Every structure is written in C-alpha cells, then in structure tokens.
C-alpha cells in the first residue's frame, strides 16, 4: 500500500496497518525534520521494524539529503531477521515500481562467522581463527609467497579472488541475506569478511552490533567509512550501560602475570635471535620511533596493530615514543620491571579500592615508570611484534592485557576506579588475589557518537521510565514520549502472585533461596502449570547456580520425575551449542505438539534477543525479583558513583534495573495483535512496581491482580483459554485496532 505522509511518498507491504505504528512513524518524521535525539517507548506487541524500514527507504530515496542510515542492533539473529524484513520490503517495492532501485545495505560480524576458508574456519576460538587468518592472509604471507614461491606461507583462495575481481564487482547491486551471500561466495569462492570490510563506505545503510560501535578496537574502524551526517537508529539498547562498562572494565589473574613473564622471556630470547641474525630491522624500528612514527604510520592498512586501541581514538597520543622505551631491549626491561611492579602489587591481603592517580603515584614512588610511557606501551609493543615477526604469539598474547590496562589507566583517571582484592574466587580453596578496573560512566563511549552524529535516534520496547537515561548518559533529547497499544481486547494477562495456593509469601532472595517450604510451594505452582500447559512455558530465576541447586534437589526428591509424563524440559546449558540444539528440539517439540519447558537467566543469553510466538510465547514465569548479586564491589562503586553524579537512588535503581531485566524477558511473548498469553509474576514485593512497569504492560495489569494467589491464577488462566479458544468478529477491530487505508484516511479527517 503506497500512501502519503505530509511530504513523503510512503509504501507499506501490507493492506493493513496499526495506528501506533502510524503515529510512531509520524513522530519519527518530526524528529528527522527537527534534528537531534529522541527516546520513544514502543508497544512490544506492535510490528515496528518493517514500518521503520519502509520510512527509512522512502526518506533516503526521496529526501535530497539522502543521508546514510545506521541501524544499531544487539545480536546477529536480530540482524538476520532485519535482513529478511528488508528483503521482503525491497521485493514488495520492486514489484510496486516494476523495477528495482539501486541500493546496498548489509550486516557486519566476525571472521569466525565469515571465514569461508574451510581450514581456518574449523578452529573453535575466534581469536585462533583471526590469528590464522592473519598469518595466511595478512599480506605478509602474500609478500613472502611473492618473494619466494617456496616460502610455504599460503593464501586463501577466497581472499585472492577478491583481488582477482573489483570491489564494486564483488556483488551485484541490491540486498543480500547472510545465507544468500554465503551461497554466492561459496559458488564464486569469495571471502565475505573482506568483502563486508570493503562494503562499509559503499552500502547506503548499515546494521551491526553494539560492540563494533562501542569498543574502540572495533569502533573507529567502522566509523571511518561511515558518513558524518548519517541517520542513527538503535534497537533495544536498554542494557547498553552494561556493554559500555564491560568494554572498559578489566581484571587480573596470577595466570596473567605468569603468562606475561613467560611471554616476555620468550620474546627477549627471540630478540636475541633477531639481533644475532640482523639488527637492521630493529634499528629501522628504533629510528622510526626516534622520528615518532606510530603503528598506523609504519604498518599498512591490511596488517593490523597487535595491541588494539584500549582507549578512545580521541584519547590517543600523537608525539614520539620516549627514550626510556625507545630501544627494544630497554622497552623489554622496562616491561619486565613493570611486571615486577604488578607482581609485588598483586600479593595484597585485603580489599583495596584506589584511584588511577593513587596507583600512578605509588608507581612513581616505588619504581620510575611514567604515565606517557604507559600510554605509549601499546603502540610500542604492537610495533615490536610487527618488526620482530614472532607469529607464534601463543606465549605472547597475554601482554596485550597488560598494555591494554597500562594505556587505559594512564589515560583514564576520573570516572574510573582501580579495585584490588585478595579473592579472585571468593568461594575457593586458596585465595587467588585480583586487581579490578571499573568503568563507572557509560556516556563516555556514546559521547563520540553524540558529537559525530546529530540525528541519533533512540528506541526500545520496555524502557520505563525514560528520565534516568539522560541521567546515566550525559545527553538530552529534543522530544521524548512513550506509546501504548490501542488493542481491541486484552490478550496479554498480567497478574502479580504474592502467595501460593497455601497463601505463603514468596521471594527469591539470596539468603532465603534455600528455604524448602517455599521450594515446595514453588513446585506446587510448577505442577499446576505443568498439568495445564498446552504448547510452551518458560521459568526464569535471578541466578543460574540457584537454578541448578533447586533443580538438583527437585530431581532428587522426584517431582521432576513425575512431571516428566506431561511435557519435556530444557535448561540453559553452559555451552550455547548445546543450548542451540536444545532450542531446535523445543522447536520440533512444539512443531509436533509435545512441547517443552525452558529455564534460563534473566541476565542470560536467552534473555537478550530470543523470540517466542503463538505456541512458543504462551506463558512465562518469573520467580522473585531478578536482582544482581549484592556484594559486587563494582556494583556498589557504580551505585555510589551515579548517586554522587546524577543523584540516582541506590535501591530505587536496583529495583528499576531488576524490573528492566524482567520486562525485557517478559517482552518475548507478543509480536503482533494476534498472539496472546498469561503473564505470571511470583514475588511479594512485585506489587509496588507498577510505576517501574512499562505503560502498556501495567495498562493490562489490574489493581485486583496486584495481590493474587495460585488458585484464582489457575482459574483466570482457565477462563482465558476458554475465552480465546473461540473466534472473534472482525468488525470489532476493523477500524479501531487494525486500520485499512480508508480507516487511516477517516482518522486523518477526524483529526483535521
């Protein structure tokens, strides 16, 4: 359906549309015309992404700016689903026009997902895949093979075909799904990793993860070829503060120092071998450090720096390497005594939380190691590894951590704290100690996104409320509001269970978690939903050890054995391969109608992008409040941190963040205006969290449902399944929840 908005011809692949999506597109168009930022809470039971794609394609083709559009996603599965949605959209628009328009827009992922060389791809670790792909495709391999054809450091045929052909002739114009381009590059023996690394400037739009946005090692590399004036759109980035912190927080082990000593000793022995063959390469490196040439100055673009950038590219140094570490032997001895300092600061007895300034002051007090060499150590080590040709870096890969930490702590001192603890494992036979680094502000990595792009547009599904996100991130929007659906009748059924059918108060606190009476209550609930579950049902808990503890004693006393006769059960395996095979079995079980029951963490891998619908999304349990573990020093420092800066209350934030995780888990049931289910919540303290609930979620929640028990919960689920076990008149939703185009026109005339 091709209709008109105020200035733009807008197409839709369906004959029908929802008003929430329509007004959402209207507000997006207003935000595009005004420029700047916006935060919009969409109703997660509305199809959003296809409307987004239709509006962006129409905006790009008709608007004479023709700004690039940057989709920003979380998971490769989300990227692939968006690829399928866009391919449906462009097929529709090609059929509508009678022709395909010129366009390119693709995804982005790793070599481990993209190495079509069958030998390099077979390695389990993506670090090993990247290392071997470097070793035989880095151009050093090509130069060795060109100099000596007998020099058997080979090249990938998929790599070499991309230089046999041209970069614009890598693909025919259009949009390719990931399986489609993998089939194409298998047919023509092409490397899609280097293809998509060469498609960054060439595609009109882009979609990728958040790691290649935030982590500076993989951030500026994408950010070079993208336009300054592009359109930025996010998706479900409510947990991006965790990703920002984990991109800038590091820990230390005794294994790290041991591996550092071994790598430094083997590196110095190789330096002795290199100086006894030919000191010319090291002399050339030393005079290039005298001149002050960096890794980008000396290395080509194909070869990459060995120690990738720990700090932001805005926080890099441009002057020369100091004379203390300018010589290779002097740098190696300096690194050795740095490891000596790290070892003698490693052996503490109790918990210390010091500043980077305090660490640097004690560093200069004890030894004579300075902040500018600690910044330059990463570049110095990368240039040393490139010159030395030490390609077996298995002993040498640990020193990347030390150079990363040194350049991080010698650049960052405020908004960051250095934590030193004597217990790497608190529940251990022996105390391994640890130094911890803490990222405390999440606005730092999204700051260069803010000053790089004006049209930064932010959205998610269950982001409620909005105000603390311009607190935790130092920004503001020109406009922000939220959206709830104008559904015909309620088909998601939220209620709060504070008590079992025995009327016993229920919770999942980390102290009273091993309370066997409340456990017996919990399994009476498990029995009663296991007896009644038609297709699928999922239970989450705040902590996977506690899941394993309760399911272990459950199997021990046999209620799992007797509920075995109803359905199957799957639990989130530690290996995500086994978890994927488990999801395949559950998909086949709901396909044949046996059905299974799922267990995973509210902060687990299933909770961050996995969808369930119409037999998979049928009902989801949450037992207790999904809190983060309380005695995390990083958590307490961040809690204090955000209170001193943005006056953010600790317990209020903890409750709000637990509700954010719970709402993110519970949003994996409803897709359009056709799915249905019962939303069951099990804690006493849930009743005071309607404000922390999203607007549409708490809209279906009743005040009588704030305190319910298992018996009338069972009753209400029965009358629910009898209710939508029956059909419904289309005329009850013909123009009030679903619109025709004529219904849209009639609403437009009603508004004007």
């Amino acid at each position: 359906m091709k209709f008109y908005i105020d200035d733009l011809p807008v197409l839709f692949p369906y004959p029908k549309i929802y008003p929430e999506q329509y007004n959402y597109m209207c507000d997006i168009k207003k935000t595009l015309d005004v420029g700047g930022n916006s935060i919009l809470e969409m109703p997660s039971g509305t199809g959003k992404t296809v409307s987004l794609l239709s509006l962006t394609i129409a905006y790009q083709m008709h608007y004479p700016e023709h700004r690039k559009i940057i989709y920003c996603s979380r998971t490769m599965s989300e990227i692939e689903k968006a690829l399928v949605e866009l391919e449906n959209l462009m097929d529709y628009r090609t059929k509508e026009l009678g022709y395909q328009e010129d366009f390119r827009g693709l995804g982005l992922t790793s070599r481990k997902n993209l190495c079509l060389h069958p030998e390099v791809s077979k390695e389990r670790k993506g670090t090993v895949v990247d290392e071997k792909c470097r070793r035989m495709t880095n151009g050093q391999a090509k130069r060795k093979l060109e100099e000596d054809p007998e020099a058997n450091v080979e090249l990938c045929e998929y790599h070499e075909n991309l230089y046999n052909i041209e970069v614009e002739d890598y693909l025919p114009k259009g949009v390719f799904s990931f399986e489609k381009l993998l089939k194409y590059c298998e047919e023509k023996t092409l490397c899609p990793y280097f293809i998509v690394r060469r498609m960054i400037s060439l595609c009109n739009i882009i979609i990728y993860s958040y790691h290649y946005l935030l982590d500076p090692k993989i951030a500026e590399r994408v950010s070079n070829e993208v336009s300054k004036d592009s359109i930025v759109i996010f998706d479900e980035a409510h947990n991006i503060d965790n990703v920002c912190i984990e991109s800038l927080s590091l820990d230390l082990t005794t294994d790290a120092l041991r591996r550092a000593t071994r790598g430094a000793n083997a590196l110095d022995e190789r330096i002795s071998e290199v100086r006894k063959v030919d000191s010319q390469k090291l002399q050339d490196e030393y005079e290039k450090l005298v001149q002050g040439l960096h890794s980008a100055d000396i290395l080509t673009d194909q070869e990459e720096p060995f120690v990738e950038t720990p700090v932001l590219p805005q926080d890099l140094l441009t002057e020369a390497i100091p004379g203390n570490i300018r010589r290779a032997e002097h740098f190696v001895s300096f690194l050795k005594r740095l490891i000596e300092y790290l070892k003698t600061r490693m052996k503490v007895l109790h918990v210390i939380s010091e500043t980077p300034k305090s660490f640097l002051q004690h560093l200069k007090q004890l030894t004579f190691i300075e902040r500018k060499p600690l910044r330059f150590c990463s570049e110095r080590l990368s240039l040393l590894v490139r010159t030395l040709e030490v390609t077996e870096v298995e002993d040498f890969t640990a020193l990347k951590d030390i150079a990363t930490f040194a350049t991080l702590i010698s650049t960052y001192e405020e908004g960051f704290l250095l934590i030193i603890e004597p217990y790497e494992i608190e529940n251990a036979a022996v105390p391994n100690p640890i130094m911890r680094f803490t990222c405390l502000d999440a606005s730092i990595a999204i700051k260069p996104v803010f000053e790089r792009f004006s049209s930064v547009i932010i959205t998610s599904g269950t982001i409620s409320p909005l105000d603390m996100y311009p607190r935790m991130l130092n920004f503001k929007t020109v406009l922000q509001k939220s959206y709830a659906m104008t559904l015909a009748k309620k088909s998601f059924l939220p209620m709060i269970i504070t008590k079992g059918s025995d009327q016993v108060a229920i919770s999942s606190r980390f102290e009273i978690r091993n309370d066997p009476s409340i456990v017996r209550n919990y399994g009476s609930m498990l029995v009663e939903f296991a007896k009644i579950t038609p297709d699928g049902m999922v239970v989450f808990f705040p902590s996977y050890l506690y899941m394993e503890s309760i399911v272990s004693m459950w199997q021990t006393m046999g209620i799992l054995d007797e509920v075995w006769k109803h359905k199957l059960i799957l639990v989130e395996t530690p290996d995500a391969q086994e978890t994927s095979l488990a999801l395949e079995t559950y998909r086949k079980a709901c396909s044949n109608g046996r059905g299974a029951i799922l267990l995973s963490v509210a902060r687990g891998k299933v909770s961050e992008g996995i969808d369930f619908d119409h037999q998979y999304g049928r009902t989801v349990l949450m037992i207790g409040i999904p809190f983060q573990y309380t005695e995390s020093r990083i958590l307490k420092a961040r809690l204090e941190f955000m209170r001193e800066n943005y006056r953010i209350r600790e317990n209020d934030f903890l409750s709000f963040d637990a509700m954010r995780h719970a709402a993110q888990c519970l949003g994996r049931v409803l897709r359009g205006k056709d799915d249905y289910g019962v939303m069951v919540l099990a804690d006493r303290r849930f009743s005071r969290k309607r404000s922390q609930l999203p607007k549409w979620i708490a809209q279906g929640l009743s005040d009588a449902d704030l305190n319910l028990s298992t018996d009338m919960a069972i009753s209400n689920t029965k009358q629910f399944l009898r209710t939508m076990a029956q059909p419904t008149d289309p005329k009850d939703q013909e123009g009030v929840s679903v619109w025709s185009y004529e219904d849209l026109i009639k609403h437009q005339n009603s508004r004007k």
């Binding site: 009644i532 579950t533 038609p534 297709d535 006769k565 109803h566 359905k567 709901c590 396909s591 044949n592 109608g593 046996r594 059905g595 119409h614 037999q615 399944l721 009898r722 076990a725 029956q726 059909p727 008149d729 005329k731």
Partner: protein, 355 residues
C-alpha cells in the same frame, strides 16, 4: 436490557450465518469415529464422567448421523493403552455401533494416546473407499500429549495425498499440532479444530458436526453412480436372508439378483449395488436447496398483518417479532420462524405466494 442483549446476540449469530449459500456438500460420506479410552477422560471434573457423557453423546451422534445421512457408513476406532483398537467398521447398521458403544460403556476407560497408530489404521480402513465416497474422520481428545512410534508429518502428507478432510474436537484448549492437522487436512482452514466450553456448547458442536460439509472445485469428483431401488415384498413364509441366513417373514427383493436383505440403506451383498429408498435421498434436499433467513421487520413501520401469518398468534409491540420470508414477503413470528428453519423445509407463505 435483556431483550436488547438477546437482539444483539441474535445479530452476532446472524452475522455468523449470513453466508447462506447453496454449496455442493459431502453426500456420499464415509466416516471414522476415533474415540479414546485414556486415563485423562476418567476425571470427575465432568459429572458423572467425561467418558460417561462421551458415551451418551456419541450414541446421540450415531442416531443423528444415521437419520440425517442414512446412505453414509461410519466406523469407530477406539484408542486405549498405547495402541488403538477397532470396534466398529463402516456399516449401514447402527445396531452394531450402538452395541459396541454400550460395550465400551460397560468397560472402563484407561490408557495413553497413539494418534499416529490411530491415523495409520484409519488410513487402512479408508484405503478401499471409492472416490465418490468422501473420506472424513472425527477426532476427540482429552489430553495435551501423545507419544507415537514414528513421525507424524509423513502420515500428515500421506493422508493429504489420500484426499481427506477431518474435524478435531479437543477438551481443554487449542493445541498447535491439531491446529496444523486441521489446517493441512482442510486446505488451510482451521475452523475444523474447535474446543468446547461446557456440555451445552459440546452438544451444539455435536449437532453442527452431524451436518455435511461443502466440497471444493479443485478436488473435483463429478461422476455418476449406478443406483437401484429394491422392491419390498410382504411375504407369506419365513424366508432366508442373504446376509445372516435366517428365516424372515417378509422383506425386499434385489433389483438384479432378486435376493432379500434385512435392512436399508445397504449395499447388495450379492450383485453388490447400493439399495436405498426415496426417503434417504429425500433427507438432504434441504441441504440441496437451503432456507434463507427471514427479515425481522422493525416496530417503526406499519405492518400488513398484526398477527402471525403461520401459527396465527398476535404479534407483540417493545420489539417487532414479525419475521418476513424474502421469498414470500410474509411476516412470521419468532416461534414459527425458528421451528420452520429447524424442522420444516418449505415456506407456506411461499406456497401462498403465486409464481
């Protein structure tokens, strides 16, 4: 507001029944009645038993189907304890099915379902079925799980290849597998998989399910059938029947081999031809031409008559229960209109109207 609620519920029913169309429907039918003795139907949530009201309502359905569709033949497969069983194959005799039903009533139900086994031997029962004889199976299920010896999807595709349409009637709620079964079995339609809410709605589902089903153009079976009536002779001697070899005072003659049979509508056992009467073909002309609904006029207008055209009773005033046949332009009462549409098959107002 009680009459207003009754009027708007009758409007919703009328919107459901607006599609009064003269579709060609399944007349030469072959039926399989899949039943289950599993332990799920032992539950006393239904009073006296799920299996109890299954037995009596199945007896009622047997009687209603043999009345409304006499020429068809219907079989009974019982599921019990991991392997389904056959107690009655397709026959023109209800008595055998009724005796099997009361034998099941006398016995206890217990077990666990194997729907693939039930479908496989149902497939073998419908294997020597002629193309004009439409193949249909009715499904009841009181559980939410089924273990099966092999995969169900090859069975699904094979039964789709065998050109079958099947209704499934579940107990608790909708199951995705049975929804997919009715979808692929019924060319994407999922109106064939329905769940009850109480016993009244259950009986209404039975009364709907007695009726034949309209047939598509794409599965065309346009042919002829070689039919012949028998001749009743009220004979003066105990005489052997062809089937059971027992001495009967009177009976029929075959139109070809002149043999006698006990009952109608039955095939010949000897020269092997379907022997019916005009009653059996006469039973479904109200399917062949239906009776469209009658115009309930409003109380605002003046009326031609203020009393019923048919039962001759005076019409009430707040609402106007004067229901006008569009084929006859005569208003009738709600009582006569409901009775004529449920039982009768001609409008006496249209008999009054000359053409």
């Amino acid at each position: 507001a009680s009459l207003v609620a009754s009027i708007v519920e009758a409007r919703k029913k009328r919107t459901a029944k607006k599609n009064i169309t003269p579709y060609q429907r399944g007349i030469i039918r072959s039926l399989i009645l899949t039943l289950d003795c599993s332990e799920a139907m032992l539950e006393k949530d239904l009073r006296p038993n799920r299996h109890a009201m299954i037995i009596q309502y199945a007896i009622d359905f047997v009687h209603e189907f043999f009345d409304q569709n006499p020429i068809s033949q219907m079989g009974i497969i019982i599921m019990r304890n991991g392997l389904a069983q056959l107690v009655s194959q397709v026959s023109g005799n209800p008595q055998d099915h009724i005796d099997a039903l009361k034998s099941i009533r006398k016995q206890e139900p217990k077990g666990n379902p194997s729907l693939q086994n039930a479908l496989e031997m149902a497939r073998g029962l419908l294997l020597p079925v002629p193309a004009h004889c439409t193949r249909e199976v009715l499904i009841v299920f009181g559980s939410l799980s089924t273990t099966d010896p092999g995969d169900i999807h090859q069975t699904i595709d094979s039964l789709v290849s065998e050109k079958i349409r099947v209704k499934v009637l579940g107990l608790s709620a909708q199951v995705a597998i049975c929804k997919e079964l009715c979808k692929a079995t019924n060319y994407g339609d999922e109106s064939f998989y329905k769940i009850l809410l109480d016993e009244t709605h259950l009986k209404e589902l039975f009364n709907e399910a007695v009726t034949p089903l309209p047939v598509n153009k794409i599965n065309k079976g346009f042919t002829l059938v070689k039919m012949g009536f028998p001749t009743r002779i009220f004979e003066d001697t105990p005489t052997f029947c062809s089937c059971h070899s027992k001495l009967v005072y009177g009976g029929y003659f075959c139109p070809n081999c002149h043999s006698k049979v006990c009952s109608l509508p039955t095939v010949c056992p000897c020269c092997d031809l379907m022997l019916i009467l005009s009653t059996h073909l006469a039973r479904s002309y109200h399917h062949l031409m239906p009776l469209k609904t009658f115009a309930e006029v409003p109380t605002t207008e003046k009326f031609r008559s203020e009393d019923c055209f048919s039962c001759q009773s005076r019409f009430p005033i707040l609402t106007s229960s004067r229901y006008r046949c569009e084929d006859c332009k005569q208003e009738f009462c709600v009582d006569c209109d409901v009775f004529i549409h449920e039982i009768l098959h001609n409008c006496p107002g249209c008999e009054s109207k000359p053409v």
